[PDB]
């Protein structure tokens, strides 16, 4: 997802 | 001249509701027939709420204030298998008035319930009327599971806004955080006392996200806006639910002004580079159009002032 992406 | 705006935050934080407000404020708004389109959604949100309450009475082991409600409860699920009838309305009205489900309702922190639950149920007589047409507020109150990236355009103060509602991808993330002018991070203030679904309070999960956002190298030149949202639900909630449920080390009193201030710091302190980047915090009610207008107007001014400063104008 876009959280862990960071 | 062009502004890439990003809506980030946990689920049910208010992101998508802000989007509606943008179309309401800086575009046409909502036509008679557009509102009629949400009629099904409203009916849906209403039904799933009362059900969730009734289901919760099974786990929590809560009895009705009248055994006669057991029949109405029965019919609720039965009727759900078929838009709003005159019989289902009474079934729900009778249930919603029962001191039984009302006790379970006031204990909604122990399970998952819609924030707009009371809104619809307390206004059932109006919504249940035949040929009823949703008010603009009714529309704002709806909860729709938005998945994927949702682009939205509008023009305000001579600025072209490209607003994205981030609510599975891979390289699509990369082509999303590219040169983001500003980020609006939404937080549901009222989610502080929500039970431990996982091993981290909903509020603590939100702090986790915000931390990675404003500290990340991606947004060194990005205006970071913090929307401490749902202040209306929070104001009423704080009177009866101690903030220590979320932050146990909280020594302040359970008042709106003091508790809210504390929560603001917990988020603003997650900023590591405090010397370089400032966080623009607003206490909002995403369903309040007059408020969102004021708050967003303020946000725009910040973005303008920062567009100038950079290319050396301010
Ligand atoms: N009372 C109140 N309700 C809100 C507020 N913000 C959002 N809501 C409601 O809570 C739900 C949030 O859904 P939404 O914002 O679309 O989900 P998200 O995009 O994943 O954050 C909606 O049904 C809204 O009606 C607020 O500030 N106050
Ligand atoms: Mg959404």
Numbering used by the authors:
A (entry chain F): 4 to 9
B (entry chain A): 32 to 113, 118 to 202, 206 to 235, 238 to 354
Give verbatim lines from the article.
G protein-coupled receptors (GPCRs) convert extracellular signals to intracellular responses, primarily by stimulating guanine nucleotide exchange on heterotrimeric G-protein Gα subunits. Upon receptor-stimulated exchange of GTP for GDP, Gα subunits undergo a conformational change, dominated by three mobile switch regions, resulting in separation of Gα from the obligate Gβγ heterodimer. Gα signaling is terminated by intrinsic hydrolysis of bound GTP to GDP, a reaction accelerated by ‘regulators of G-protein signaling’ (RGS proteins), and reversion of the Gα switch conformation to the inactive, GDP-bound state. Gα·GDP can then re-assemble a heterotrimer with Gβγ or, in the case of the Gαi/o subfamily, engage GoLoco motif proteins that are also selective for the inactive Gα state.
To understand how the G42R P-loop substitution affects Gα subunit structure and function, we obtained a 3.0 Å resolution crystal structure model of Gαi1(G42R) bound to GDP using the inactive state-selective phage display peptide KB-752 as a crystallography tool. The asymmetric unit contained three Gαi1(G42R) subunits bound to GDP and Mg2+; two of three monomers were bound to the KB-752 peptide, while the third (chain C) lacked electron density for the peptide and instead displayed switch region disorder characteristic of free, GDP-bound Gα subunits. The side chain of Arg-42 projects away from the nucleotide-binding pocket, making no direct contacts with other Gαi1(G42R) residues. Arg-178 is known to stabilize the leaving phosphate group during GTP hydrolysis; its perturbation in the Gαi1(G42R) structure model is consistent with the previously assumed GTPase deficiency of G42R mutants. We next sought a structural explanation for the disrupted conformational switch of Gα(G42R) mutants. As previously mentioned, the Arg-42 side chain conformation, as modeled in the free GDP-bound Gαi1(G42R), would not allow glutamine-204 to assume its critical position for orienting the nucleophilic water required for GTP hydrolysis. Superposition of Gαi1(G42R)·GDP suggests that the bulky Arg-42 side chain would not be easily accommodated by the active switch conformations observed in wild type Gαi1·GTPγS. The arginine as modeled would sterically prevent the positioning of switch 3 residues Leu-234 and Glu-236 as seen in the wild type, activated state. Thus, the Arg side chain likely sterically prevents a normal activated conformation of the switch regions. Our crystal structure models of Gαi1(G42R) indicates that this perturbed conformational flexibility is likely due to steric hindrance and electrostatic repulsion between the mutant Arg-42 side chain and residues of the switch regions.
